[PDB]
Amino acid sequence: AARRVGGIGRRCFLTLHCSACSFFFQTSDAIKLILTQQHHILRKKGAASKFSLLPLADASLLLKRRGALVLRSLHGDPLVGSRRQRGEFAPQAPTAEMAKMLNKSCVPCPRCKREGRWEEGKK
């Protein structure tokens, strides 16, 4: 409890969960899953700007700094902003935005391979 990462209230501003199962992860994992599941997203949608991000579908490429830095650029620091963003203006959870993006992309849940769901927080 001294340094437990939930606060006293067990806040999970970055956690996301699937309502179809008990699977849950965070925003960085969601971004990684989105980059890995481009083929499914592109197939559902259906040299070119559309496929420009395909190279990032490789696990080894992402593990390499060449891909890790791209991952960290895409997934910035939602909990870090300007210094004036304090008190009543502290950052809020972007879990809603991430869930909306995932649902619109129709990315599949790793544990149940569903299509929708992916509510905010942790179930």
Partner: peptide, 25 residues
């Protein structure tokens, strides 16, 4: 800014729910 304030911001992130290291590396 100050190292103490940087650590405070990291602790705030941890309380909000982001596991980040406290090492001053």
């Amino acid at each position: 800014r100050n190292k103490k304030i940087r650590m405070s911001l990291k602790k705030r992130r941890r309380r909000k729910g982001k596991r980040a290291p406290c090492r001053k590396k």
